[PDB]
Amino acid sequence: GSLQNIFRATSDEVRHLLSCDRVLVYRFNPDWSGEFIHESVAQMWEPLKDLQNNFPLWQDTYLQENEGGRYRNHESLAVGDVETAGFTDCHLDNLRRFEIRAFLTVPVFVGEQLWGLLGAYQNGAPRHWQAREIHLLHQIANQLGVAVYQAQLLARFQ
Amino acid sequence: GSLQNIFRATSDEVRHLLSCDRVLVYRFNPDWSGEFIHESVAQMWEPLKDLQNNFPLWQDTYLQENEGGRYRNHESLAVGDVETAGFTDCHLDNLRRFEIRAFLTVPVFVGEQLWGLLGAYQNGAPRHWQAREIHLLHQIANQLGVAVYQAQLLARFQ
Numbered sequence: 452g453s454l455q456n457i458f459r460a461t462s463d464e465v466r467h468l469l470s471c472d473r474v475l476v477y478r479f480n481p482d483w484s485g486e487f488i489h490e491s492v493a494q495m496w497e498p499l500k501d502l503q504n505n506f507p508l509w510q511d512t513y514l515q516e517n518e519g520g521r522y523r524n525h526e527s528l529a530v531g532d533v534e535t536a537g538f539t540d541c542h543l544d545n546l547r548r549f550e551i552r553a554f555l556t557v558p559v560f561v562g563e564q565l566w567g568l569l570g571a572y573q574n575g576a577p578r579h580w581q582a583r584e585i586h587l588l589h590q591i592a593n594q595l596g597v598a599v600y601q602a603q604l605l606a607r608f609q
Numbered sequence: 610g611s612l613q614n615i616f617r618a619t620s621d622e623v624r625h626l627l628s629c630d631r632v633l634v635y636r637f638n639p640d641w642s643g644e645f646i647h648e649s650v651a652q653m654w655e656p657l658k659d660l661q662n663n664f665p666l667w668q669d670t671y672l673q674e675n676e677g678g679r680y681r682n683h684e685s686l687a688v689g690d691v692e693t694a695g696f697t698d699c700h701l702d703n704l705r706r707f708e709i710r711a712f713l714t715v716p717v718f719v720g721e722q723l724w725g726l727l728g729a730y731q732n733g734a735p736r737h738w739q740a741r742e743i744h745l746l747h748q749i750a751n752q753l754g755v756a757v758y759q760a761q762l763l764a765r766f767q
């Protein structure tokens with residue numbers, strides 16, 4: 452509740468600051484599968500969130516098998532054109548399915564834990580992500596993670 | 610500056626809530642030695658902080674050699690009477706030097722790192738620390754660590 456407010460604020464802020472088309476918050480499950488729990492999207496695009504406020508599944512075997520992959524090391528991935536990135540077909544198929552032409556995805560650490568991912572997406576054209584934008588989203592995600600942990604500390608004690 | 614305000618608020622809050630005699634904030638150095646950086650103490654006791662706002666050294670070889678010891682695992686140590694605890698003499702000597710008769714010392718995690726320790730001390734009598742008090746100080750330290758990390762995130766970016 453207070454949490455969805457945090458996710459809304461952050462996601463809308465990213466979309467506003469980066470002028471991207473979609474922003475997603477993705478939370479890892481214990482087995483390193485994950486779940487979308489928030490979307491900010493411009494009105495011209497089909498939303499991933501349906502009318503029951505449910506999201507599609509992105510079953511990324513690679514993140515799961517590598518228990519978060521590069522994100523374990525506080526690293527991000529910026530891809531300017533998914534079509535030229537040399538991705539595995541099952542991965543590219545999901546990128547296309549979610550109308551992702553370019554993405555910038557950074558880790559969200561909550562306390563000491565890799566809690567999830569924060570993604571910024573361009574839907575209708577490639578995008579050369581600037582080093583500054585990467586640095587900015589990295590910090591927005593750090594701030595999100597601290598907000599989540601702060602909320603947990605208050606909610607779960609007294 | 611804003612940091613010393615955080616340390617003051619936390620330390621004074623602990624001393625107030627626990628009705629203990631002294632509270633100390635101890636920050637680890639890279640080599641797992643450490644430094645006192647704040648004290649809250651009742652007026653009837655000699656302070657550890659001198660007129661130059663410098664603190665004495667507590668050179669604890671055990672914390673250093675064990676890179677933080679039990680505190681690496683989010684554990685605390687509560688000792689009701691240092692005189693009956695079976696401590697090594699070099700350790701007991703420092704406890705006596707700092708007028709510590711009973712202590713409750715918990716870890717302070719800043720993001721993913723064991724940043725320091727938060728200690729509550731009784732100076733003039735033994736004290737049986739209640740499980741609740743241990744649980745409370747543990748959370749006050751969690752909150753302190755989040756405040757420190759939040760301050761760092763804001764101070765060091767833009």
Ligand SMILES: *[C@H](C)[C@H]1/C(=C/c2[nH]c(/C=C3N=C(/C=C4\NC(=O)C(CC)=C4C)C(C)=C\3CCC(=O)O)c(CCC(=O)O)c2C)NC(=O)[C@@H]1C
Binds near residue numbers: 476477512554556570
């Ligand atoms: C094959 C059956 C499935 C598959 C394989 C796959 N994935 C990757 C690499 C990554 N997948 C992601 C997933 C996401 N990006 C986002 O923006 C979001 C929402 C926030 C998700 C869930 C990411 C970030 C990576 C990079 C991971 C890294 O550590 O670098 C690979 C490796 C790269 C490649 O394509 O060869 C593979 C093989 N993903 C699927 O969806 C298939 C069902």
Ligand SMILES: *[C@H](C)[C@H]1/C(=C/c2[nH]c(/C=C3N=C(/C=C4\NC(=O)C(CC)=C4C)C(C)=C\3CCC(=O)O)c(CCC(=O)O)c2C)NC(=O)[C@@H]1C
Binds near residue numbers: 671695699700701727
């Ligand atoms: C011997 C030359 C020196 C020595 C040895 C020593 N220390 C310990 C165990 C601990 N020492 C501390 C230190 C602190 N308690 C506080 O409240 C503060 C300020 C915040 C400090 C710096 C702590 C917390 C422990 C417990 C550590 C743990 O992981 O359990 C030992 C082991 C216990 C024993 O006495 O045998 C030893 C041998 N400490 C000194 O000061 C000597 C100079």
